[PDB]
Write a protein that binds this ligand. Structure first.
Ligand SMILES: *[C@](O)(C(N)=O)[C@H](CC1CCC1)NC(=O)[C@@H]1[C@@H]2[C@H](CN1C(=O)[C@@H](NC(=O)NC(C)(C)C)C(C)(C)C)C2(C)C
Ligand SMILES: *[C@](O)(C(N)=O)[C@H](CC1CCC1)NC(=O)[C@@H]1[C@@H]2[C@H](CN1C(=O)[C@@H](NC(=O)NC(C)(C)C)C(C)(C)C)C2(C)C
Ligand SMILES: [Cl-]
Lengths: 302, 302
């Protein structure tokens, strides 16, 4: 038994991380095939950061202003390009450690493993959720930019996030690997709002299912509810409205616990309404929304 | 900014995990040099498990009863040995992916990265603390046995845990890599007590320091305390008694926050005494004791 925030093994992604220096700025790059991907603001000075014209700024840059290092090895850039908010640096060598990979754009409520790097060196790995407001709550210091988020499905790495910037609270924004920001963010040092974040209701139910499977049952109750009734007690508490896919996606967990999704929704209502009263579920004194149904199935089966 | 439970990158350890089958039992092995290490209870039947004589049970086993697989490759065992509660299977091939490594026995209150495996395949990575009672709170299903816990210092893997068994609550016990159990546990399916677990006070202070560094200050208070006075309010609340090394180890964090350790101890007392009143510190509604001072320094500096 036991239930933990667990990241995918990071090995396949370690061999893809390089260092990228342009002028004074150094940060992380993803080297797949003959292409290093990194955030385009590696070309900015402290000053440019306030209101950059990236086209103009990049014109002043030539292949030899881009210092790509892979441990001790340096890579000949033979082509620079911009795709939205990322730099593609075409290099001479194909990364021999290149894994089967894809670039996917993940949807709000989905999770992925971040391999946080500094100077092209991986320092650690943890799981994030894409929040409904398209922020993440990570651990990213100066130098962390260009670190990536990924899923491993089969033997195939699905790259879905690259880190760009930090927002007031301590929350992170970044791009997919084609360089489109998740959410309304631009790579400019100028006031931008994240706006209201809500709880991923289906993930909270997935987690209650994980609780029951590990024996934590105390919150399980005699009552039930309707979808409408509950979903009016959701929005009250800023929770993503529960749909019928959400029900059908909890099937495997409903199936394994022999607990109907709507019985479980009624246990949630009383915790939203009566709090947790100083009790814990799975070592946590609050409701956890950063595990998907699949995250729970993967961990609670094998 | 940001502060997360972060595991070391798992790559160096992925290339060391093999499958080990004896009779019906299959579990995980650590292949370093010409030696595969695994739990010795791979030789037991469901029945043997209740009261094994390992010496006697192992005599009936010969090199060819041990089926070691590394993905699709099979390894010729040319020597079986028992060191306390682990099997050393001498094989023909030296693991070419063998990293600089050491075997260390970690002390209660220290943390390490678990790479959880099934059938010799890594499925995920997370951080654990060796609890004061020498249990961990992991995520280990049938097949997880032989999964290892490690630190990466410099380029050198320090192997410190191998998973053997689960204790009532959902808590895990295992050995160092010489095969000595942490704590009073024996590899026999017979009633054993963990007995009373206490909170790693120095780790809770390290975490309050991480909070302050990320801006969460509300619990910071005007008061101070003595070491004796606080340490009498510790044991009340089952907390490891705070020593002067603990003070001197918090130096780097005291140094960076400009907050004396004993001011911080007085903030802790009021949270132990007045609870958290529905507020959160670093996204948690309870006091976190599974980050060491070094874990916090590593993450909060680079
Ligand atoms: C990286 O680029 C890096 N080199 O690691 C860096 C990581 C952060 C954490 C300290 C620096 N990110 C940025 O520098 C990022 C780049 C400029 C400014 N950036 C910010 O993240 C800024 N945030 C910010 O301005 N936020 C709001 C936009 C005003 C909402 C910081 C204030 C955190 C520096 C750009 C192009 C946004
Ligand atoms: C592994 O050996 C494995 N193959 O993965 C396994 C993992 C656990 C999780 C389900 C099985 N561990 C054991 O089988 C372990 C081996 C026997 C019995 N084991 C237990 O962990 C048992 N615990 C237990 O008996 N606990 C107390 C000791 C009575 C305190 C289980 C009941 C969990 C099976 C041995 C040699 C202890
Ligand atoms: Cl919590």
């Amino acid at each position: 038994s036991g239930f933990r925030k667990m990241a995918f093994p990071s090995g396949k992604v370690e061999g893809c991380m390089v260092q990228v220096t342009c002028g004074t700025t150094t940060l992380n790059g993803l080297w797949l095939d003959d292409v290093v991907y990194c955030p385009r603001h590696v070309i900015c000075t402290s000053e440019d950061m306030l209101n950059p014209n990236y086209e103009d700024l990049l014109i002043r840059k030539s292949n030899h202003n881009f210092l790509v290092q892979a441990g001790n090895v340096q890579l000949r850039v033979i082509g620079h390009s911009m795709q939205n908010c990322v730099l593609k640096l075409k290099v001479d060598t194909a990364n021999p450690k290149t894994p089967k990979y894809k670039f996917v754009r993940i949807q709000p409520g989905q999770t992925f493993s971040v391999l946080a790097c500094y100077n092209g060196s991986p320092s650690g790995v943890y799981q994030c959720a894409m929040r409904p407001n398209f922020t993440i709550k990570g651990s990213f210091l100066n130098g962390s930019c260009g670190s990536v988020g990924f899923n491993i499905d089969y033997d195939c790495v699905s790259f879905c996030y690259m880190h760009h910037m930090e927002l007031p609270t301590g929350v992170h924004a970044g791009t997919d690997l084609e360089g489109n920001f998740y959410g309304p963010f631009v790579d400019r040092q100028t006031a931008q709002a994240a706006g209201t974040d809500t709880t991923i209701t289906v993930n909270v139910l997935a987690w209650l299912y994980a609780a029951v499977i590990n024996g934590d049952r105390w919150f399980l109750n005699r009552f039930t509810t309707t979808l409408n009734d509950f979903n009016l007690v959701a929005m009250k508490y800023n929770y993503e409205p529960l749909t019928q896919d959400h029900v059908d996606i909890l099937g495997p967990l409903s199936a394994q616990t022999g607990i109907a999704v709507l019985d479980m929704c009624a246990s949630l209502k009383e915790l939203l309404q009566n709090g947790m009263n100083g009790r814990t579920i799975l070592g946590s004194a609050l409701l956890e929304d950063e595990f998907t149904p699949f995250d729970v199935v993967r961990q609670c089966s094998g």
